[PDB]
Amino acid sequence: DTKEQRILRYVQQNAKPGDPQSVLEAIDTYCTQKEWAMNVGDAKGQIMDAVIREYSPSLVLELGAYCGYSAVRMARLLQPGARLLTMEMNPDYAAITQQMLNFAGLQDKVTILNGASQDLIPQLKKKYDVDTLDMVFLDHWKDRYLPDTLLLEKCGLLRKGTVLLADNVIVPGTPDFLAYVRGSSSFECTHYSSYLEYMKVVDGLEKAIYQG
Ligand SMILES: Nc1ncnc2c1ncn2[C@@H]1O[C@H](/C=C/CNC(=O)c2cc([N+](=O)[O-])cc(O)c2O)[C@@H](O)[C@H]1O
Ligand SMILES: [Mg+2]
Protein backbone atom coordinates (compact mmCIF):
# COMPACT_ATOMS: atom_id res chain seq x y z
CA ASP A 1 0.00 0.00 0.00
CA THR A 2 1.52 3.29 -1.24
CA LYS A 3 1.16 6.53 0.73
CA GLU A 4 0.30 7.93 -2.68
CA GLN A 5 -2.46 5.45 -3.59
CA ARG A 6 -3.55 5.82 0.03
CA ILE A 7 -4.63 9.36 -0.78
CA LEU A 8 -6.02 8.37 -4.19
CA ARG A 9 -8.46 6.06 -2.43
CA TYR A 10 -9.39 8.61 0.22
CA VAL A 11 -10.43 10.98 -2.54
CA GLN A 12 -12.48 8.22 -4.17
CA GLN A 13 -14.21 7.62 -0.85
CA ASN A 14 -14.64 11.27 0.13
CA ALA A 15 -14.59 13.51 -2.93
CA LYS A 16 -17.70 14.56 -4.84
CA PRO A 17 -17.00 12.94 -8.25
CA GLY A 18 -16.40 15.30 -11.16
CA ASP A 19 -15.93 18.13 -8.64
CA PRO A 20 -12.34 19.53 -8.83
CA GLN A 21 -12.97 21.70 -5.78
CA SER A 22 -13.93 18.73 -3.61
CA VAL A 23 -10.93 16.71 -4.75
CA LEU A 24 -8.57 19.52 -3.72
CA GLU A 25 -10.21 19.71 -0.31
CA ALA A 26 -10.02 15.95 0.19
CA ILE A 27 -6.30 15.81 -0.62
CA ASP A 28 -5.57 18.76 1.68
CA THR A 29 -7.47 17.45 4.70
CA TYR A 30 -5.88 14.01 4.43
CA CYS A 31 -2.38 15.50 4.31
CA THR A 32 -3.31 17.81 7.17
CA GLN A 33 -4.82 15.45 9.76
CA LYS A 34 -3.03 12.24 8.73
CA GLU A 35 -0.01 11.72 6.46
CA TRP A 36 2.08 14.58 5.03
CA ALA A 37 2.83 14.85 1.32
CA MET A 38 4.61 17.22 -1.07
CA ASN A 39 1.48 18.88 -2.47
CA VAL A 40 1.76 22.63 -3.12
CA GLY A 41 -1.10 23.03 -0.65
CA ASP A 42 -3.99 25.47 -0.35
CA ALA A 43 -1.99 28.55 0.70
CA LYS A 44 0.34 28.55 -2.30
CA GLY A 45 -2.52 27.03 -4.26
CA GLN A 46 -4.51 30.24 -3.90
CA ILE A 47 -1.61 32.24 -5.27
CA MET A 48 -1.45 29.79 -8.19
CA ASP A 49 -5.14 30.27 -8.81
CA ALA A 50 -4.67 34.05 -8.71
CA VAL A 51 -1.75 34.03 -11.16
CA ILE A 52 -3.50 31.59 -13.52
CA ARG A 53 -6.62 33.75 -13.62
CA GLU A 54 -4.56 36.82 -14.42
CA TYR A 55 -2.78 35.24 -17.37
CA SER A 56 -5.50 32.77 -18.40
CA PRO A 57 -2.92 30.75 -20.35
CA SER A 58 -3.85 28.64 -23.36
CA LEU A 59 -0.97 26.14 -23.05
CA VAL A 60 0.56 25.32 -19.67
CA LEU A 61 3.49 23.04 -18.85
CA GLU A 62 3.71 21.37 -15.44
CA LEU A 63 6.99 19.76 -14.36
CA GLY A 64 6.38 16.99 -11.87
CA ALA A 65 2.83 15.82 -11.16
CA TYR A 66 3.23 13.60 -8.10
CA CYS A 67 -0.41 12.93 -7.14
CA GLY A 68 -1.96 15.42 -9.58
CA TYR A 69 -2.97 17.90 -6.88
CA SER A 70 -1.64 21.02 -8.62
CA ALA A 71 -2.63 19.53 -11.98
CA VAL A 72 -6.21 19.62 -10.71
CA ARG A 73 -5.76 23.06 -9.15
CA MET A 74 -4.54 24.35 -12.49
CA ALA A 75 -6.83 22.45 -14.87
CA ARG A 76 -10.06 23.29 -13.04
CA LEU A 77 -9.31 26.94 -13.86
CA LEU A 78 -8.53 26.46 -17.55
CA GLN A 79 -10.80 28.10 -20.13
CA PRO A 80 -12.38 25.87 -22.81
CA GLY A 81 -9.76 24.72 -25.29
CA ALA A 82 -6.88 25.32 -22.90
CA ARG A 83 -4.65 22.31 -22.42
CA LEU A 84 -2.27 21.36 -19.61
CA LEU A 85 0.72 19.10 -20.22
CA THR A 86 2.32 17.53 -17.17
CA MET A 87 5.53 15.50 -17.14
CA GLU A 88 6.02 12.82 -14.47
CA MET A 89 8.95 10.37 -14.57
CA ASN A 90 7.59 7.98 -11.91
CA PRO A 91 5.09 5.57 -13.52
CA ASP A 92 3.34 5.00 -10.20
CA TYR A 93 2.82 8.74 -9.77
CA ALA A 94 1.80 9.38 -13.37
CA ALA A 95 -0.75 6.67 -12.67
CA ILE A 96 -2.32 8.10 -9.53
CA THR A 97 -2.32 11.51 -11.20
CA GLN A 98 -4.23 10.26 -14.25
CA GLN A 99 -6.94 8.81 -12.01
CA MET A 100 -7.01 11.94 -9.86
CA LEU A 101 -7.84 13.85 -13.04
CA ASN A 102 -10.31 11.27 -14.35
CA PHE A 103 -12.17 11.51 -11.05
CA ALA A 104 -12.39 15.29 -11.34
CA GLY A 105 -13.60 15.00 -14.91
CA LEU A 106 -10.65 17.23 -15.75
CA GLN A 107 -9.11 14.48 -17.87
CA ASP A 108 -10.06 15.93 -21.26
CA LYS A 109 -7.87 18.98 -20.76
CA VAL A 110 -4.77 17.29 -19.33
CA THR A 111 -2.23 15.28 -21.33
CA ILE A 112 0.12 13.34 -19.06
CA LEU A 113 3.62 12.58 -20.36
CA ASN A 114 5.38 9.81 -18.42
CA GLY A 115 9.13 10.42 -18.51
CA ALA A 116 11.93 12.72 -17.39
CA SER A 117 11.64 16.41 -18.24
CA GLN A 118 15.14 16.66 -19.74
CA ASP A 119 14.18 13.85 -22.11
CA LEU A 120 10.56 14.83 -22.84
CA ILE A 121 11.06 18.59 -23.21
CA PRO A 122 13.03 18.44 -26.47
CA GLN A 123 10.40 16.12 -28.02
CA LEU A 124 7.55 18.38 -26.94
CA LYS A 125 7.13 20.41 -30.13
CA LYS A 126 6.92 17.70 -32.79
CA LYS A 127 5.53 14.79 -30.79
CA TYR A 128 2.88 16.83 -29.00
CA ASP A 129 1.89 19.58 -31.42
CA VAL A 130 3.27 22.52 -29.46
CA ASP A 131 4.82 25.81 -30.46
CA THR A 132 5.41 27.92 -27.34
CA LEU A 133 4.27 27.64 -23.73
CA ASP A 134 2.16 30.35 -22.12
CA MET A 135 2.98 29.22 -18.61
CA VAL A 136 5.26 26.66 -16.96
CA PHE A 137 4.83 25.37 -13.40
CA LEU A 138 8.02 23.96 -11.84
CA ASP A 139 7.60 21.55 -8.92
CA HIS A 140 9.83 18.52 -9.63
CA TRP A 141 13.40 17.77 -8.38
CA LYS A 142 14.87 21.07 -7.17
CA ASP A 143 18.15 20.62 -9.02
CA ARG A 144 16.18 20.31 -12.28
CA TYR A 145 14.65 23.81 -12.26
CA LEU A 146 17.60 25.62 -13.86
CA PRO A 147 18.68 22.92 -16.35
CA ASP A 148 15.10 22.52 -17.63
CA THR A 149 14.75 26.31 -17.94
CA LEU A 150 17.87 26.51 -20.09
CA LEU A 151 16.59 23.45 -21.92
CA LEU A 152 13.15 25.01 -22.41
CA GLU A 153 14.82 28.13 -23.74
CA LYS A 154 17.01 26.20 -26.16
CA CYS A 155 14.09 24.32 -27.71
CA GLY A 156 12.35 27.62 -28.43
CA LEU A 157 9.46 26.76 -26.12
CA LEU A 158 9.71 30.09 -24.35
CA ARG A 159 8.01 33.14 -25.77
CA LYS A 160 8.21 36.83 -24.84
CA GLY A 161 5.73 36.93 -21.96
CA THR A 162 5.83 33.27 -20.98
CA VAL A 163 5.19 32.88 -17.27
CA LEU A 164 7.35 30.62 -15.11
CA LEU A 165 5.88 29.85 -11.70
CA ALA A 166 8.15 27.94 -9.37
CA ASP A 167 7.34 26.21 -6.10
CA ASN A 168 9.69 25.58 -3.16
CA VAL A 169 11.92 28.47 -4.15
CA ILE A 170 12.70 28.91 -0.44
CA VAL A 171 12.11 25.40 0.97
CA PRO A 172 13.45 22.90 0.12
CA GLY A 173 14.96 25.75 -1.89
CA THR A 174 16.32 26.25 -5.40
CA PRO A 175 19.34 28.60 -5.05
CA ASP A 176 20.82 28.23 -8.55
CA PHE A 177 17.46 28.69 -10.27
CA LEU A 178 16.57 31.79 -8.24
CA ALA A 179 20.02 33.30 -8.60
CA TYR A 180 19.97 32.71 -12.34
CA VAL A 181 16.44 34.00 -12.93
CA ARG A 182 16.74 37.13 -10.78
CA GLY A 183 20.07 38.10 -12.27
CA SER A 184 19.14 37.39 -15.86
CA SER A 185 17.90 40.28 -17.97
CA SER A 186 15.76 37.74 -19.81
CA PHE A 187 13.57 37.23 -16.76
CA GLU A 188 11.42 39.72 -14.90
CA CYS A 189 10.88 38.26 -11.42
CA THR A 190 8.39 38.72 -8.61
CA HIS A 191 8.29 36.87 -5.32
CA TYR A 192 5.12 35.69 -3.50
CA SER A 193 5.84 34.71 0.10
CA SER A 194 3.64 31.97 1.52
CA TYR A 195 3.96 28.88 3.69
CA LEU A 196 5.18 25.33 3.12
CA GLU A 197 2.24 22.97 2.65
CA TYR A 198 0.58 21.50 5.74
CA MET A 199 2.55 23.32 8.49
CA LYS A 200 3.79 26.85 9.18
CA VAL A 201 7.21 27.19 7.61
CA VAL A 202 8.15 30.12 5.39
CA ASP A 203 8.38 29.24 1.69
CA GLY A 204 7.38 31.09 -1.43
CA LEU A 205 6.59 30.95 -5.11
CA GLU A 206 8.61 32.76 -7.72
CA LYS A 207 7.13 34.15 -10.92
CA ALA A 208 9.70 34.62 -13.67
CA ILE A 209 8.47 36.10 -16.92
CA TYR A 210 10.62 35.49 -19.95
CA GLN A 211 11.51 38.58 -21.96
CA GLY A 212 13.45 37.10 -24.88
N1 LIG B 1 13.08 15.32 -14.25
C2 LIG B 1 11.77 15.04 -13.97
N3 LIG B 1 10.88 14.94 -14.99
C4 LIG B 1 9.59 14.61 -14.71
N5 LIG B 1 9.10 14.35 -13.50
C6 LIG B 1 9.97 14.48 -12.47
C7 LIG B 1 11.32 14.82 -12.63
N8 LIG B 1 11.96 14.87 -11.44
C9 LIG B 1 11.04 14.58 -10.53
N10 LIG B 1 9.79 14.31 -11.11
C11 LIG B 1 8.57 14.00 -10.30
O12 LIG B 1 8.10 15.20 -9.65
C13 LIG B 1 7.90 14.97 -8.22
C14 LIG B 1 9.02 15.61 -7.52
C15 LIG B 1 8.81 16.31 -6.42
C16 LIG B 1 9.95 16.98 -5.74
N17 LIG B 1 9.45 17.94 -4.78
C18 LIG B 1 9.94 18.05 -3.53
O19 LIG B 1 10.97 17.47 -3.24
C20 LIG B 1 9.22 18.91 -2.60
C21 LIG B 1 9.58 18.89 -1.24
C22 LIG B 1 8.88 19.69 -0.35
N23 LIG B 1 9.22 19.64 1.08
O24 LIG B 1 10.30 19.14 1.45
O25 LIG B 1 8.45 20.17 1.88
C26 LIG B 1 7.84 20.55 -0.75
C27 LIG B 1 7.49 20.57 -2.10
O28 LIG B 1 6.51 21.38 -2.57
C29 LIG B 1 8.16 19.75 -3.02
O30 LIG B 1 7.75 19.82 -4.32
C31 LIG B 1 7.97 13.47 -8.02
O32 LIG B 1 6.67 12.90 -8.18
C33 LIG B 1 8.90 13.03 -9.14
O34 LIG B 1 8.54 11.70 -9.51
MG1 LIG C 1 6.35 21.67 -4.51
User: Is 109 annotated to bind ligand?
Assistant: no
Is 60 known as a binding-site position?
A: no
> Using a 6 Å cutoff on CB, does residue 64 contact ligand 1?
yes
What are the angstrom distances between the C-alpha of 50 and each of 9, 156, 161, 171, 201? 29, 27, 17, 21, 21
Method: X-ray
Q: Does domain 1-212 have CATH number 3.40.50.150?
A: yes
Domain segments of the chain as ranges: 1-212
Question: Tell me, what amino acid is at 174?
Answer: T
Q: Which residues are catalytic?
A: 139, 142, 167-168, 197
Note whether 41 and 28 are within 8 A (CB): yes
Q: How many CB atoms lie within 10 A of CB 26?
A: 20
Q: Which of 82, 130, 87, 141 is nearest to 112 (CA)?
A: 87
Does ligand 1 lie within 6 Å of residue 116's CB atom? yes
Contact 73 CB / ligand 1 (< 6 Å):
no
How many angstroms separate the Cα of 10 from the Cα of each of 13, 76, 179? 5, 20, 39
168 is in an annotated binding site: yes
Which protein residue's CA is at the shortest distance from atom 19 of ligand 1? Answer: 141
